[model samples]
Target: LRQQKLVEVAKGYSLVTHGDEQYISYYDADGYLVLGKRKLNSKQWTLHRTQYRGAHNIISIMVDGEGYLHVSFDHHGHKLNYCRSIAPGSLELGDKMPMTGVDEGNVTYPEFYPLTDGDLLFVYRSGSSGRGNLVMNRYSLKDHKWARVQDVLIDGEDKRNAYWQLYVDEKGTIHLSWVWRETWQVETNHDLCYARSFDNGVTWYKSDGEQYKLPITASNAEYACRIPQNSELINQTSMSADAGGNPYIATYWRSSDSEVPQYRIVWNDGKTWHNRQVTDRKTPFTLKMIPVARPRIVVEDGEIFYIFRDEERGSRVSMAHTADVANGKWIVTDLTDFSVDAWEPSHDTELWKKQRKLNLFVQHTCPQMIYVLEANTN
Candidate 1:
């Protein structure tokens, strides 16, 4: 696959698609927040630089059912900063605003998710990394208002916090998975937990159809897999679901039987959750010292696609996928001709959901590039 240059970016930020338009958000070399848009049919891009700027945090973006673009950025345990396109399908963003104005202070990992009914769900962590709790809000497309959905869905109990990823499947069922961390250290991240909500973010259920009590705690939460601390386990990687709504999570860790850390998948069939190691890496690395790009995953027609950076492959942007996940086999391929250094992968979720094409946001040494990969299922 060949990569196309987009623009020189400060870092790999985010890429999202809605209908015929593809939108990108990232910081420029001067640390200014920039938004770019282009129709899928053409390669010409219209770039707009916002007055707002921050380099300490990454940006999350999504287009609502009303075609309005929503963005959350410049957050690292600070006040919530957000804005939206002034007009539908426009690159220009309005002034920053609050969502519900509650627990809006000390925010981190701000993310946006689009619901099936044109509404939008916003989730973020409140407090510091070790002592934070998860907060959620919902936006009403019809009323142009935002309301609190879950004040504290996952409580840290003032001792620990959860690093999580969220995915709304095609059926509008929200799938959430996270790893519990005891403190600020990345090695303290342990145990994968999961929950799903069919009624937006109001109610959540375990994988076995068991209803969870509000404010899911460590004791009552459903454990998908119990990975111990200092196991080289990574948190906040990525997740996706298949056509039948089976959830798949991608992360890397060193198994008990192996010395090197390898990328793995923890997925749920209708009956039970299963674990499979997808990479056979030779070089060993730790999250405590070196920076490792979190993996990004998506599923299409029962096939799994995982994108990550690894030292075993010369730290290039690489992908490992398999249609037969049950067979514990994967076909590995290097996507970029050169290295992406410490860059992570962010693809257009709406585009993949609609066209089965992978539009990845890749930064080849600060010059942001894109690769339009055809997810050749046939």
Candidate 2:
């Protein structure tokens, strides 16, 4: 298939300072504009805000059916802290809720999922000094409160020092995936682990006991360590369910040679793990994948759609679709060109803090969420 068949749905740049525009999420069909643009002015769109104190960044966003948007960020103080909006939409000043109070360093890269009762479930990393811990929290929309549930400790000692990615299948079963480093005595490798919460975020079951070893190199060369580091951490994992309630996870990882960064989709049927490499090309730009890795997947009308940042091309958003993942062909489209100029500055001035802003734009590296519905062809 050719690239021209792919169409542009929505595109814009970010205008929220230089680095504050980080994580992003979307409801099934809510209408909203890109950051810094004219919001819909209607109650349908919910926006939240928090000032950055030279540190901290948003990781993940999840929107529920009731219009509540749950967000997780890293507050780079001495501890790991989580914040949430009481409901969906945006937040103004003086509007924030803390999720945890532990002394975690990089408490960012969180995942949100909706529960049966319209509540929300989340998983994030806690603890500081790079030896982070994973913790689960639940929020009750009915009561408007948040509570911590479990602390995921490895072998009852080592802390899981990475962000946890959460997903819920059609059967309402929640799945979580994360990476943890082995204790210093055992070995020097990071392990990819998996768990499941049958009863939402209250309790979890270790689905896979085996750990996927992260590829590492021992070369003392200048770029040796840097190359392997880029491909080891597969962040921003997302899950999608097929007709039988099976779950599939999509994540970004560096190629073995560290020359190409790509995404992989792994599924759990009943017993074993099956994976598929999603990206076809290995361009140079893939190496600079960001900390807020936003990868998303959706299945609608028997078709699976995967959307992610085209790191090879200006960090613009790109999409790929397949009818049946097992036997279907993947078609990728570059959607960046459509909205590249949508938010340019009105006037040209190097010294002006007084130039008129043309339009609010979206960052190429921002996380993208997708919701599929019936096409409105008029």
Candidate 3:
């Protein structure tokens, strides 16, 4: 019998252009699609374009309950803020907010999350001259103002740095995870730490206190964090949480000396961590693993889906899914053709010919969210 092929349900949006794409936030509600794109403006700054710039200048976008879209980006270490309502279909450029309180030289990797009300929480890294640390800010839509919430200094004087991964849970809890190095040690010896604030973004404390110290090895050190199923784990490149808040982590780990890196799933069932192997390929040749970047995971309805850009094969986004994250089998979809190709390869041959000629393309990076559209809205 022949194996059933996975179906592609969504197509890539042709509204954006190609650059060092990161920070992808999607807000889909009612009948509109609000997307955010943060591009590397230059070595010193990043540009946040909320409006249409001929598929070039599009930055982070957040949609509120009142249909107001808030957009922001960093330019030359300065932040450009703006917002507009889709109903009015007009762009309103707000005042430029600066890193006033914290010492700033370079700031990057900005992540924004919307609150229950019209408020917004922003997190990014700030450094003094050379090295940087993580910082968080809370912006109120009611007052139309911004204020610093948390300024955490990761590395004191050692010059080693800390990269932040921010997550806001359903209960309005903010969780931050990052790898901090004591000295100029190589990426191998960095320590993974996490802190959380239950009362909005005011105060943060270690999730497990002193007992939990996550160490990184020289082989696999980079990591990402997810609140799927309300469970937290470090170094999971790909993950999706179920309705019960159990997170399924997918990552490439060495199984044996002969085979390529295999995909492993680790889950916490309110007690212990359960580990299992999902794929046995040395490496998903089409999907190359990045040392620090984490794969994107989402749980829609009852199915758990994982999406990643195939860095090795033209950066084309590919997806995999499982009905039951705990014991259900995983299904890998075929390589999606984001960019138009002259000739289409046979599904069977493409799966076997790992080195087949194909161009990879990236329509977006760091897929933040995915949701189903209601028929009435469509």
Candidate 4:
């Protein structure tokens, strides 16, 4: 693994890869949206600074099957902010546009998931912390248009909200999991729940293929783990799926028996759900509402890799991997020598699926560096 200087960015940002080229998005020191493109294995990057400016909120980027880049940024209970490349595989965006214009205001955590058939799915929270709904939209490559797939896929019922992380696997299965939050307080997050969609975001199901009723609520959702609130459970972490489309979710929370919040991977093995505590940290830290880098997961060649930052490990950029997940043991290693303050992991998931490569967006010491690691998976 080696690091390359891209540009300085804030705490939150995003990046993606299409074919042999990779694209990245970040707010430069001047708060301008700077998009960069580089060919795989090349050192030179062609960057374009868009006129649009975003704050410290996360910037999500994705490339559809047709090679056009899409971005959604500067969102935290704000109106939809989005744009796309004027041409395929170009960093030059046209103008800010709306997806469906329904529930477009008050958006947060906007993510783009590419499907198997050259289309894309946009998912975001449509309301505030405890009153939000998970809304999804689908983009067609043929028509170059976006349509509302779910106006409210996961309803909060105005009492609680869901903090979710999604993964669209090689089989085009949208694997979704989230923790329920009863209020704006982080301690109110509880109960890791899960649901999957096969026909884009139109239909959903559990691990066993049981179809779910629309707008999956608290009572009807599948509880992957019934974690209690105030357990130090962190939400909006990360999830990944294997070639077989088995879901592996990475998160951290403390148990009542211990004061330490340890990293964990809760996965489904087609038959049932399993939990594995992958860390043995001695120090403990409390999670706040800030944009701290949370756990990110990726599984390849039967090995499960989790990226995170921990005070116990000097708060550096670290990773833990294990081929033998049944034993619940992992070999932890630091990917960077320096600590990335408040920086989260945003890797190119599409490149990983196609080439088994890992390209992590790092801020080695946000004004952001990028790293590439060719996994020696045997």
Candidate 5:
């Protein structure tokens, strides 16, 4: 009983991207949940008989815009186990199939977005992000199923909502941000919210545009603003847009008194809303005591890494970047001195500009080996 403790376990595994190529999903001790694809330039992989239904825990893959392949996992949280792949015309479906008519209820964080006119947008969260109720469903290639993309895009009634993420900038618009845990107290997150919808979700604003009304709860003075800290947000607040669309939020906060290191970002740029604190020191983790890991943030081109866990080097795992975070400047790297139970950043891989890279996904501890960091620039 001394191999680091064995089978550490944390978060679930998933990474997706299309067009330039990059996909890797997980959950494979036997039950299945694979989906590899890393050849051309080679991370060395080839999987695709696709098994994904053993999902006892984590799995959420996506790749739309017509390339197909979209799934939701074992969802032990309720009943969602959806699947996709086989859209766009004649139907040659192969990769993953089961969408068994929206696969029943009680979902979790199953996401997939594309919709620019081509259609395909399915987000999730039905009962426990604390108190659940952030469901959007769209995808209707001519009524194959899934309809309601509205009716209440977010409203954790009886309280609780710590994880929430959705982005669709460049113009089509549809950004969302969350971190509001305090209906009873899961440690406390306070606030850090935003909403937008130029046309997609139906029409909702507030970041200054003023218009927020329709299940945007938690007091809704338009949320009254700021991204969670009571427990440093727990984890689940990521969105990126900047090609001029502007909208960045890659969180990791600390509000007990506001130190200086928690790694954060909050942007608007069209008019106002800008923030920074990207760390220089003192950023370990502590909700009540250390244990927080899964801060995960990534913004390319201008750069912004930020992985978590390393409060005095317990489970090690670090990496804090910033091509230039205001004036403090950031560039800390020690990516995995060791002891990681979980880690992520592969929402389809672009690292930061499609060339200079950094891919993270560790889950090692004892006999748990499953690593990959692959940093490059040449």
Candidate 6:
């Protein structure tokens, strides 16, 4: 029933577009991890699988700075089942350990991000929601093993969940932001905190360009600068850096448990912070509201775009941003021709008047369990 998807096997992981090739990984219905590659356009390619059993539907794939096809999967609190191709694009498919002399357990949401030095970095959580810390390990092609770079022991309090977005810019700086939630209470994830590692995850800094001690904790009030949060919900992570190495977060915002949402964009100008209320929440069409999927962002040459989906609008997507983020004059576009599914709103005209549904989507690529859409506020 789930045909017509460009990357059919890609359950939820974003498609990788690096250098000149696009790479993706998924578990075919046969219960094996499959890796596929293709050229620039809407081209067809091979679907190759490995011996490993992948799970959680979301397989994080990336072609690193050295052209290596690095992947980590079966990663929802499972064994560290990660393997890199023997070489750049090699398909021998041998089971190789990502790290040497290590305890490879509780490694979930394994994010393979390319660094500027032709090396690859893997970020994951070492503990569960009840108590956890954001950890970073890097692949050393020369050392031939993954070394623990920075383990962000972000939790230093009661049960708190650290949900974050991880990235490294052209400046070789590692920037990360996480929302620490009160696990004892519902809808209690209320802080927007961030810190960056400048010397290869060895030294960190707050947003104001000041030095912060390592392993920034949840209560590192002064070190990890706290920014305004997108309260109602904020797991779908969209983070990017401008050509000048400044960070930007584009997400959705809801005032309380039940309210329409708004576009939240935050950035720093090295002098002060700027929060852009791109546009007030646009009223929805029934259960079709609040960006359900993790919104993605792009900042290039001179433009920045925030791309996200409406619940029931198959291909009817929106892209919002401004020529310069410093100025809050954001522009949004409703591009009508992006649908690549049978549910494309135009073709499936039967949807509007008589559609009945139970829709399941990934808001922040959550684990098996997450807070639900309470009253559809945002």
After TM-score superposition, what is the CA distance of residue 36 in candidate 1 from its true location, in Å?
0.8
Model 4 lDDT per residue over 202-313, tens place:
8899998899998888989999999998888987888999998889898888888997788888988899999988878887667652333588877874588788877667
**TM-score against native, each model:** 0.93, 0.59, 0.57, 0.92, 0.31, 0.77
CA lDDT, every model vs. true structure: 0.80, 0.44, 0.41, 0.80, 0.59, 0.55
Residue-level lDDT tens digits of model 5 in 52-168 = 446246676666556666677754767767666566321122443334344345676677776675566777776534356777777765555567767466666764654678777
- Expressed as tens digits, the lDDT of each residue in 58-104 for candidate 2 is 44454444555454444353444344445344442224446655434
- Residue 313's lDDT within candidate 3 is 35
Name the 10 consecutive residues with the lowest summed lDDT in model 3: 344-353
Per-prediction CA RMSD (Å): 2.6, 11.7, 12.1, 3.0, 18.4, 9.5
The runs of at least 3 residues in candidate 4 whose Cα sits more than 4 Å from the true structure, single-residue gaps closed, are 1-13, 128-130, 288-293, 365-378
- Least well predicted 10-residue stretch by lDDT in candidate 6: 344-353
Backbone N/Cα/C clashes per model = 0, 20, 8, 5, 7, 1
Model 6 quality (TM-score): 0.77
Query: Which residue pairs show collisions in model 6?
Result: 315-339
User: Clashing pairs in model 3?
Assistant: 37-59, 229-245, 229-246, 237-295, 260-282, 261-282, 314-360, 314-361
- Which 10-residue window in model 5 sums to the lowest lDDT? 1-10
Instruction: Point out where model 3 deviates above 4 Å.
Output: 1-58, 75-89, 99-105, 153-159, 180-195, 203-259, 262-267, 274-278, 283-294, 300-303, 311-316, 335-378
Question: Against the hidden true structure, what lDDT does model 2 obtain?
Answer: 0.44
Better of 4 and 6 by lDDT: 4
Residue pairs that clash (backbone atoms under 3 angstroms), model 4: 7-368, 8-367, 8-368, 9-366, 9-367
Better of 2 and 5 by lDDT: 5
Q: How do all the candidates rank in terms of lDDT, highest first? A: 1, 4, 5, 6, 2, 3
Model 3 Cα lDDT, one tens digit per residue, 120-195: 7776656445555566777776776668875653434454555555545444555554554434433222334345
Top candidate when judged by TM-score against the true structure: 1
